[PDB]
Design a protein around this ligand. Structure first.
Ligand SMILES: *C[C@H]1C(=O)[C@]23[C@H](O)[C@H]1CC[C@H]2[C@@]12CO[C@]3(O)[C@@H](O)[C@@H]1C(C)(C)CC[C@@H]2O
Ligand SMILES: *C[C@H]1C(=O)[C@]23[C@H](O)[C@H]1CC[C@H]2[C@@]12CO[C@]3(O)[C@@H](O)[C@@H]1C(C)(C)CC[C@@H]2O
Ligand SMILES: [Ca+2]
Ligand SMILES: [Ca+2]
Ligand SMILES: [Ca+2]
Ligand SMILES: [Ca+2]
Ligand SMILES: [Ca+2]
Ligand SMILES: [Ca+2]
Lengths: 92, 92
């Protein structure tokens, strides 16, 4: 597989690992999203240590308003992060 | 870096490699997008061998209508592919 293909699979993998912990196995609840961010984005995002930060992050990502982050919403989050880093690294 | 973080960097890397070949170094023209798809998505997408396919792919991805695929448009493309694979692999 190419680096791009492996990246696609990694995105699916990490979402699977975290979404499947509790409740709906295909959505991230607050606790699952928090742990995904804290364990897997520790170099890109500040560690979440406050309930109010958990709440605001979910509120921002939950565009369909069901209180959880589904795969499409997770991809939008990944796009946000990647775009920020693209602009940072390319000086855009 | 986590697998998720490495994936983010890979997306930026592959876009950088292809966008920087010709013209605007931060957008993919038709030839650059074609080669990105053919070289880097050879296991996910059928190889593009026809001008009309190149044209339709760019037409679909070029949501701002400037004739090229920028980073945001590339991320939307990655989201399309990853979502398709997520649904395939999770039986969603
Ligand atoms: C690509 C990531 C990165 O290196 C950032 C962010 O996490 C994200 C884009 C913006 C980068 C920062 C903010 O945090 C970073 O981790 C850090 O490397 C960057 C510093 C060095 C703090 C400069 C600001 C920039 O926004
Ligand atoms: C995750 C990718 C994948 O494995 C696919 C696609 O490229 C994408 C999701 C859908 C998969 C297919 C179509 O092409 C694939 O490469 C292939 O593995 C899948 C087959 C086996 C052809 C079954 C249909 C499915 O849509
Ligand atoms: Ca869950
Ligand atoms: Ca939601
Ligand atoms: Ca939804
Ligand atoms: Ca270019
Ligand atoms: Ca465009
Ligand atoms: Ca644009």
């Amino acid at each position: 597989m190419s680096e791009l293909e492996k990246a696609v699979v990694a995105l699916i993998d990490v979402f699977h690992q975290y979404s499947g912990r509790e409740g709906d196995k295909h959505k991230l609840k607050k606790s699952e999203l928090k742990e995904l961010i804290n364990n897997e984005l520790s170099h890109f995002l500040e560690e979440i240590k406050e309930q109010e930060v958990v709440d605001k992050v979910m509120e921002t990502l939950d565009s369909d308003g069901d209180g959880e982050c589904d795969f499409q919403e997770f991809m939008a989050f990944v796009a946000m992060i990647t775009t920020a880093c693209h602009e940072f690294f390319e000086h855009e």
